[PDB]
């Protein structure tokens, strides 16, 4: 192929063939002219080595090159290799009718929908649009149809809104480790340029929306559309194939919303009255006459399907909370009330959803999941559960727990100052005392976090579970488990050297307080070790996957 200007791009095989042809022609010329035996032997050796370079360049003593020691690729080089035909062009090949974009979360989408930009839709569904312009008779042929599509005529958008009506699109974030990484979605046009993805699906893709690109492929033929809708649709993949675990496990924010909504407080506005039904409860809340966490008695009605399969309606008075009575308006008509009569968290909600799939079926389950997501988002917005430095609590006894524990190490040092202990025993006593101190600090911090709430119930103070922002985040299982709140409010604790040795002097600070220079330098050891561990293991995992697929 030529390049910019009157030059043709260098071709490796062409040059290998050129070398071989020149050497062989020289050998023929000599054999015609009867060159001495020594010369013809040398020419024959050179010809053999040139054929060697043409075939499997590199198996020679040294590969030949025509550049800055960049050896030329041979035929065997083109056959095998990660850039070879097998893994570069046959097993995986670039496909038309595809694109990519930066994704963003659209909470309004249904589970089976996804939003795509108008521009990407127009540039992917071009032939379908032509297939309407002739069928509508609005365009004469392709020559005018393409021009009209270029004209982005306002009628062309009506054509797109008709073409895209029921045509699935495949969305494929990469790296797609498991089959749940490729799914079909019914598209809806969106003004912007980002791909609107559903919240509940992002868990399956492991898709954090911090600038994560994702690709779309348009299934063209009829069987392709049917296969997408029947096998790869979002609603057809609610269970994980690796274990009996839903892949629609509720997101981090939604579970926070449900945890905030169904929780109960000791004394609250609108407490103790009797509500005639969930609707009246909801009205009360929206009129502001009652608090969401208020304790109340609402008449609940539930349906239980018999062993044969017909629902039996039973109605009763139930002691519950206003939030639970509101949520009960969303749970389908087949479940017991005991699932919503508890403060739901990322675990407790999950089994709930599973039970729905266990009883009602797929079709009730998907709509129930969407409704749970909607309600969770709305009431989490109403919660306004902000986080601030005022919310990170240092237990007051911590300074004492340090002041004693360090002193004990001093005693372990004093023995070492007296020759009464060995070298190793001093180390393994100091580190154990520090670990016990870390446990005490963490226990006091957790106890203070849960104890920070005490309220008056019409008389005499009584304690209860804490509405502390960090506590609700941890307890709901959204983000920030015990090991996180412990580092944020207890002490950072011990650390390890790159050789793994336990630091005799733990990081006695926590991130709410300032860490000093040496403490931070100690922390860098673990931080970089973890980052390097990730960067190196992300490759061995993939290689193991390839070996497994190619053996099975």
């Amino acid at each position: 192929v030529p390049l910019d200007g009157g030059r043709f791009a260098t071709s490796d095989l062409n040059d290998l063939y050129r070398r071989v042809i020149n050497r062989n022609n020289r050998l023929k010329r000599l054999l015609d002219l009867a060159a001495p035996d020594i010369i013809v032997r040398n020419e024959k050796r050179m010809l053999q080595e040139a054929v060697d370079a043409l075939l499997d360049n590199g198996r020679r003593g040294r590969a030949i090159t025509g550049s800055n020691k960049r050896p030329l690729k041979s035929l065997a080089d083109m056959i095998k290799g990660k850039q070879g035909r097998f893994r570069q062009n046959l097993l995986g090949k670039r496909v038309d009718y595809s694109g990519r974009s930066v994704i963003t979360v659209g909470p309004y989408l249904r589970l089976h929908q996804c939003g795509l930009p108008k521009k990407m839709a127009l540039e992917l569904f071009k032939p379908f649009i032509y297939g309407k312009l002739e069928l509508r008779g609005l365009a004469t042929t392709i020559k005018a149809a393409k021009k009209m599509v270029e004209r982005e005529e306002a009628v062309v958008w009506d054509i797109l809104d008709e073409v895209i009506r029921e045509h699935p699109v495949l969305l494929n974030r990469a790296p797609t480790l498991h089959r749940l990484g490729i799914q079909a979605f019914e598209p809806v046009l969106i003004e912007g340029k980002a791909i609107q993805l559903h919240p509940l699906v992002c868990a399956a893709y492991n898709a954090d929306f911090d600038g994560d690109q994702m690709a779309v492929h348009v299934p063209l033929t009829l069987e392709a559309q049917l296969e997408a809708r029947a096998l790869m649709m979002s609603t057809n993949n609610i269970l994980s194939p690796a274990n009996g675990e839903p892949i629609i496990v509720p997101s981090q924010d939604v579970v926070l919303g449900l945890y905030y909504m169904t929780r109960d407080c000791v004394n609250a506005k609108g407490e103790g009255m009797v509500l005639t039904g969930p609707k009246e409860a909801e009205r009360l809340y929206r009129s502001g006459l009652a608090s969401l966490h208020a304790r109340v008695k609402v008449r609940i009605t539930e349906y239980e399907k018999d062993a044969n399969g017909e629902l039996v309606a039973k109605t009763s008075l139930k002691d519950t909370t206003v939030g639970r009575a509101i949520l009960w308006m969303i749970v389908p008509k087949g479940l017991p009330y005991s699932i919503v009569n508890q403060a739901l968290g990322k675990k407790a909600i999950s089994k709930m959803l599973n039970t729905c799939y266990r009883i009602l079926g797929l079709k009730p389950t998907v709509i129930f999941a969407d409704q749970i997501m909607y309600t969770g988002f709305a009431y989490a917005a109403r919660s306004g559960a902000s986080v601030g430095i005022d919310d990170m609590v240092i237990p007051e006894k911590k300074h004492e727990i340090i002041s004693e524990a360090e002193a004990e190490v001093a005693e372990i040092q004093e023995q070492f100052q007296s020759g009464l202990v060995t070298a190793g025993e001093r180390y393994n006593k100091v580190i154990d005392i520090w670990a016990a101190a870390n446990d005490r600090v963490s226990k006091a911090m957790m106890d203070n976090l849960q104890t920070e709430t005490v309220i008056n119930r019409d008389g005499q103070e009584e304690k209860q579970v804490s509405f502390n922002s960090i506590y609700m985040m941890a307890d709901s299982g959204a983000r920030g488990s015990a090991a996180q709140i412990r580092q944020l409010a207890g002490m950072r604790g011990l650390m390890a050297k790159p050789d793994g040795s336990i630091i005799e002097t733990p990081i006695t600070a926590n991130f709410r307080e300032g860490l000093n220079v040496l403490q931070y330098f100690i922390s860098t050891h673990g931080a970089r070790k973890g980052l390097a561990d990730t960067a190196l293991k992300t490759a061995n995992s993939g290689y193991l996957t390839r070996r497994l697929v190619d053996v099975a």
Partner: protein
């Protein structure tokens, strides 16, 4: 305390506590001081091009009997300055001229020369130069060469467990690494046999070297072993005993004499036994013949009578041998000390493995194993051995290498020659054997005391040396074969090898990084970057956890946080703030010299190796303002270990809390409160921010900006103090005060500010003024703010008012909700300057043309084209418009149409044309415009200078015969002989008149040269006739999909541009701009985001109070009264400011620059505690809680429980969506295999990888796969029949067969393989 005028506009409140004793040094001196050490000539020829030449010249031909020797080199000035060279696209370099003296001696006579020819600095090559910003211009493209970090030359000892044979034992191996020459490695075999190798060749016996060194087995054994003596006097074989040789060991045999027996058989030996023995004079002792039999003799002993070998070196003795040899007349036997734990036989074991005999044998074996296929020869094996390790051409320990080597051998002297010596190798072997006995310790390879930094001025020197070596190789032969008579030194050499070598280094080396000019911070953090990669280093795919992980000696020299996480973590590092390179190349850092009990103000730099010899106090220790440690005991680090030590025991103290971090991490406030992972992400992201359109300031910074923005080289800085005279947003002219005015020079300094110019990331880099007409300035003040800088302080982004709360899920776990107000204010809009070129070549069928008369085109697209065929400047264009009317011969409509998607304003068109071909009309107009501008610039310079000069002349004529009538009578130029007495005033007038005449001629010559340059037909190098450059400005706004980020590792794409109504508002009605997510604060341990935010609130609150006090016409006394209170608040802070001295003019001026929030400084590890944030919030009427209640704009309800609201500094990262959204229906297809092209700049489709194929196979989708891999991509006939059916509305495919597979078949059939399809 005195505040500079640039500083005396916004007195940023500082929360620091420690007094900064050492200000941050120049941040780019790492580059400049090296290239300065390179280009500068030096009588100590070392460290420069003169060193490279003296390492080559003089050069002589032994057969020639004549030499040529280097005399001197003088560097010609660059032909084009940085700006012109960047515009045209050439490299910025200087011509090297070298004086060569060719001396021809004479045969049959002493070296008295017949003739010597000194060439007048013959041309040698073009060497690139380092621009004052620290960057090289190579092809218009601006490059930065990263300083490399690699193992220092010397000797290194290493051993490992498990990695070798896993059998518990460790193998000790030593390596000698010269600066330029062959590696030499000594190693122990698993059976304790010592061998050597060169360049990791095959194992050869170690002692063969000594045979090559001409050592007899007797000499070697004496060198390495100890002698134990037996005598045949006074008794049969009494032994000379050294009692200390017996210790710990059980005395396994009888030894008794002289009364008391010291130790009997079967018992150990202790010290008191040694004392009794020493009292006993054990010079002779009784041992049985069996003990004498186990020894091994030290020397050859022949039969004295027959002259035949009866004993030899390393021969093991026995009873009969003893009797025989003593009978032969050798009554004094000497054997080797071979204590197993103490005196191992390793050398003797090598003797047992040695198949070679002597020096001839040594050379034979060395030659055969070094060069298989090459026959040995006595005269030739020396030619190999000496060149291996003794000849300068192939061995040179650098000065740093020799210093490190002598340090490893504990020598008293470090100044030694570069070639190894016999005792030098002997000492290396001795240290190796001692380490094998365990009496030493192995070194750490990844220890900053073993790895040294090479910079540009050294790698370039090495490349120049390589070029000169090739040139010498050629010209030695030329002089040997040349007739030496008609030859001249220009004939001897040709520039091509040297020029090619240096050109390759500066153009395509692995370390010639293309500069990432995103903003001033990216430039700085890229110029001070340290790399472990590159030639002579390791590779990203062959490095393990050992080299990546941080090190206890990295403290104070290398930032442990700022590393490019991903494929090459830990291999690319950023040099610490204060660290600097030692003379030898190691990294040294300054520490405050602690004297006994006081911390003095004396800074001594300690390197990575010296630091272990001291005890260093941490910079956070308190002192009593007398220098004494307030704490009785202070935490210090000694040998990597850190622990408490008593006061007045410490020896040094770190100079500042920022000594551990780099600039990228130094700019992050509250770095102490962020987990190191989020710190790393924030530090990496901070250099990706795009310069916004109206970047202002950070409310909460760390004070490091006042240096980063100055040393970045992007802001216009006042060279000297003076008063501004004229500003027009392009050229600021300063009347430099006479205190620094040169007596004859103009005394008035211009500053031509650079306007909108494309950067390496297609961004605009225009500089805008900030000083006012008549404002006084002092040398070093920032006159014009560059991009991302404002009022001399670095400002990457905008401070948006953010709230932490879930809001209907639009901020779901990474997403960001942004009010429409911020996009209405153009907070984040930024300009992108794209460069599109339309080339035209003299094709084989004829020369191409650029014309508005393009064939096959209507006037609709020509509307934007001119009469010549180029777009009018300032016309707004979109994708698809024709910008250039090029035509190709034989006709074709090849013309530049705007690329799809992009749209903007055409702001610049530079047409470079090869001469000979006629210039198009618009090119003529542009050239005339350039010429008019150049003439106007030169004329304005000369005329303003003439005004100043004539005014100075009239001022001289004030005293000395002032005559107003005769002064205004004639024109001012006819003042050659104005009335003035015979004094020195007429001398000053004559001096300045000669100066004016010189200025006249200089104006003339510069104008003519500039006209010739501009009119020059630009060199279109390869067979090309003309090129048209076009520059497009795109004002990209912010849209969903764009990526924004804080300074705390918080990042996310904006998910919705929420209208103003839907945003929450507080009880004052002010709506928040950005709604962030709360659930992220804990999980990602970045609680810094919610102290800064709190502080930010207070930082605005003070401004909110000032603005009212400025909006309400408060009296200045009260305004000052408030502001001073806002400044004096806090602890005993380092910064103290008394606004009283501001005369109310600077008070009002400060307020006008403070009404938008008082900037606050929170140093990295000397930052503000929460108690001060609470105090500052208390100063405002803001809640001391930090959290406010908000109201939902849609429903008017109040959110339950208050929420955190504040002013977080947010940055728009350079990853906007419009550069990444792409979709393809049909277009280009590749040639060899018909699969669609791949990429964005090419209309390509996404690659369907193997993992996607596996996932499709996981479902039962087979039709989907068949389509995806046959019709969509590969089957050429099928994909058209599919296209037709889809247009027809049939939706049916005919797959056929993927062409690529057929290609594969041909590729296998081209071999000796017949692979074919089968029917059944």
């Amino acid at each position: 305390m005195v505040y500079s005028y640039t500083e005396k506009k916004r007195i940023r409140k500082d929360f620091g506590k420690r007094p900064q004793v050492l200000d941050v040094p120049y941040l780019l001196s790492i580059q400049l001081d090296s290239f300065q050490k390179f280009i500068e000539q030096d009588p100590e020829g070392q460290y420069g091009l003169e060193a490279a030449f003296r390492s080559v010249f003089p050069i002589q031909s032994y057969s020639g009997n004549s030499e040529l020797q280097y005399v001197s080199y003088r560097l010609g000035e660059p032909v084009f300055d940085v700006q012109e060279c960047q515009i045209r696209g050439v490299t910025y370099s200087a011509p090297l001229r070298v004086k060569l003296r060719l001396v021809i001696y004479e045969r049959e006579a002493p070296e008295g020369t017949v003739k010597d020819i000194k060439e007048q600095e013959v041309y040698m090559g073009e060497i690139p130069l380092m621009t004052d910003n620290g960057t090289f211009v190579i092809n218009g493209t601006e490059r930065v060469i990263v300083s490399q970090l690699h193992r220092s030359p010397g000797v290194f000892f290493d051993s490992d467990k498990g990695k070798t044979h896993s059998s518990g034992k460790v193998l000790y191996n030593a390596r000698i690494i010269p600066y330029r020459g062959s590696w030499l490695d000594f190693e122990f075999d698993p059976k304790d046999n010592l061998f050597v190798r060169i360049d990791r060749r095959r194992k050869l016996p170690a002692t063969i070297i000594l045979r090559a060194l001409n050592y007899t087995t007797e000499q070697i054994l004496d060198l390495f072993f100890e002698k134990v003596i037996f005598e045949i006097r006074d008794n049969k074989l009494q032994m000379e005993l050294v009692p200390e040789r017996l210790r710990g060991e059980t005395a396994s045999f009888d030894i008794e004499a002289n009364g008391k027996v010291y130790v009997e058989k079967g018992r150990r030996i202790t010290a008191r036994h040694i004392r009794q023995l020493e009292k006993d004079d054990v010079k002779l002792i009784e041992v049985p013949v069996e003990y004498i039999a186990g020894k091994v003799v030290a020397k050859d002993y022949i039969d004295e009578s027959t002259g035949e070998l009866i004993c030899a070196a390393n021969m093991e003795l026995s009873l009969d041998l003893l009797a025989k040899l003593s009978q032969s007349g050798h009554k004094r036997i000497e054997t080797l000390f071979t204590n197993d734990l103490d005196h191992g036989p390793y050398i003797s074991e090598t003797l047992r493995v040695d198949p070679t005999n002597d020096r001839l044998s040594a050379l034979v074996e060395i030659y055969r194993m070094m060069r298989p296929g090459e026959p040995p020869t006595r005269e030739a094996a020396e030619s190999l051995f000496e060149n291996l390790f003794f000849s300068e051409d192939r061995y040179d320990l650098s000065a740093v290498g020799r210093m490190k080597f002598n340090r490893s051998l504990l020598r008293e002297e470090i100044e030694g020659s570069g070639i190894l010596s016999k005792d030098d190798i002997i000492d290396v072997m001795k240290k190796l054997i001692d380490i094998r006995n365990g009496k030493g310790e192995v070194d750490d390879i990844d220890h900053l005391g073993n790895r040294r930094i090479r910079s540009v001025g050294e790698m370039a020197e090495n490349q120049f040396r390589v070029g000169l070596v090739r040139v010498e190789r050629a010209v030695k032969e030329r002089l040997s074969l040349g007739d030496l008579d008609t030859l001249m030194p220009q004939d001897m050499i040709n520039a091509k090898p040297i020029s090619a070598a240096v050109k390759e280094f500066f153009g395509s080396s692995q370390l010639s990084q293309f500069m990432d000019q995103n903003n001033p911070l990216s430039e700085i953090t890229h110029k001070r970057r340290i790399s472990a990669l590159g030639p002579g280093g390791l590779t990203r795919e062959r490095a393990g956890f050992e080299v990546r992980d941080v090190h206890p000696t990295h403290y104070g020299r290398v930032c442990p946080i700022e590393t490019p996480e991903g494929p090459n973590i830990g291999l690319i590092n950023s040099l610490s703030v204060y660290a600097q390179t030692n003379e030898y190349g190691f990294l040294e850092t300054p520490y405050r010299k602690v004297t006994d009990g006081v911390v003095t103000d004396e800074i001594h730099y300690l390197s990575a190796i010296e630091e272990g010899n001291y005890v260093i106090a941490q910079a956070n220790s308190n002192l009593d303002e007398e220098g004494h440690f307030v704490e009785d005991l202070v935490t210090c680090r000694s040998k990597g270990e850190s622990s408490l030590f008593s006061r007045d025991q410490v020896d040094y103290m770190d100079v500042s809390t920022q000594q551990v971090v780099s600039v990228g991490a130094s700019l992050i406030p509250f770095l102490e409160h962020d987990d190191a992972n989020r710190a790393l992400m924030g530090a990496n992201m901070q250099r990706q921010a795009v310069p916004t359109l109206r970047a202002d300031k950070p409310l909460v910074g760390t004070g490091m900006e006042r240096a980063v923005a100055v040393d970045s080289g992007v802001t216009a800085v006042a060279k000297r103090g003076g008063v501004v005279q004229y500003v027009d947003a392009s050229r600021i002219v300063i009347k430099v005060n006479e205190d620094e005015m040169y007596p004859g020079e103009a005394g008035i300094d211009i500053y031509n500010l650079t306007k909108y110019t494309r950067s390496n990331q297609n961004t605009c880099i225009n500089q805008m003024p900030c000083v006012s007409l008549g404002e006084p300035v002092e040398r070093g003040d920032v006159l014009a703010d560059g991009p991302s800088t404002d009022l001399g302080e670095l400002a990457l982004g905008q401070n948006m008012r953010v709230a932490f709360m879930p809001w209907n899920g639009y901020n779901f776990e990474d997403s960001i909700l942004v009010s429409e107000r911020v996009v209405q204010e153009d907070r984040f809009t930024t300009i992108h300057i794209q460069e599109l070129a339309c080339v035209s070549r003299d094709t084989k069928l004829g020369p191409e043309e650029i014309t508005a008369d393009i064939p096959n085109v209507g006037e609709a697209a020509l509307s934007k084209l001119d009469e010549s065929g180029i777009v009018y400047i300032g016309a707004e264009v979109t994708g698809g418009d024709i910008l250039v009317g090029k035509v190709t011969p034989k006709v074709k409509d090849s013309s530049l149409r705007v690329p799809n998607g992009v749209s903007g304003t055409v702001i610049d068109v530079q047409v470079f044309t090869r001469d000979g071909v006629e210039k198009d009309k618009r090119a003529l107009e542009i050239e005339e415009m350039q010429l008019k501008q150049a003439k106007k610039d030169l004329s304005e310079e000369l005329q303003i200078l003439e005004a100043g000069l004539f005014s100075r002349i009239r001022a001289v004529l004030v005293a000395g015969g002032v005559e107003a009538e005769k002064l205004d009578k004639l024109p001012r130029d006819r003042w050659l002989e104005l009335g003035l007495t015979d004094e020195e005033k007429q001398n000053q007038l004559e001096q300045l008149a000669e100066q004016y005449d010189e200025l006249k001629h200089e104006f003339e010559k510069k104008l003519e040269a500039k006209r010739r340059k501009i009119t020059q037909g630009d060199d279109l190098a390869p067979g090309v006739l003309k090129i048209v450059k076009v520059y497009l400005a795109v004002k990209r706004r912010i849209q969903p999909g764009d990526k924004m980020a804080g300074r705390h590792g918080n990042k996310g794409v904006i998910s919705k541009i929420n209208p103003i109504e839907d945003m929450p508002y507080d009880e004052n009605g002010t709506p928040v701009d950005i709604v962030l997510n709360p659930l992220g604060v804990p999980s990602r341990m970045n609680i810094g985001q919610i102290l800064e935010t709190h502080l930010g609130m207070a930082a605005k609150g003070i401004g909110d109070k000032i603005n009212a006090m400025l909006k309400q016409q408060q009296e200045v006394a009260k305004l000052r009264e408030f502001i001073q209170r806002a400044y004096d608040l806090g602890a005993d802070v380092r910064q103290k400011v008394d606004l009283s001295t501001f005369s109310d003019e600077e008070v009002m001026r400060l307020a006008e620059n403070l009404r938008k929030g008082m900037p606050i400084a929170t140093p990295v590890f000397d930052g503000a505690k929460e108690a001060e944030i609470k105090e500052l919030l208390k100063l405002g009427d803001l809640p001391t809680s930090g959290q406010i209640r908000l109201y939902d704009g849609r429903t008017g309800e109040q959110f339950e429980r208050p929420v955190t609201v504040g002013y977080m500094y947010m940055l728009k990262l350079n990853h906007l969506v419009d550069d990444k959204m792409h979709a393809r229906s049909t277009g280009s297809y590749s040639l060899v295999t018909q699969q669609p092209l791949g990429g964005k700049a090419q209309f390509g489709g996404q690659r369907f990888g193997e993992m996607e194929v596996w996932a499709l196979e996981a479902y039962g989708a087979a039709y989907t796969l068949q389509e995806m891999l046959t019709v969509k991509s590969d089957d050429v006939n099928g994909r058209t029949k599919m296209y037709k059916n889809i247009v027809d509305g049939n939706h049916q495919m005919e797959p056929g067969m993927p062409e690529s597979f057929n290609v594969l078949l041909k590729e296998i059939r081209s071999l000796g393989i017949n692979i074919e399809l089968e029917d059944e």
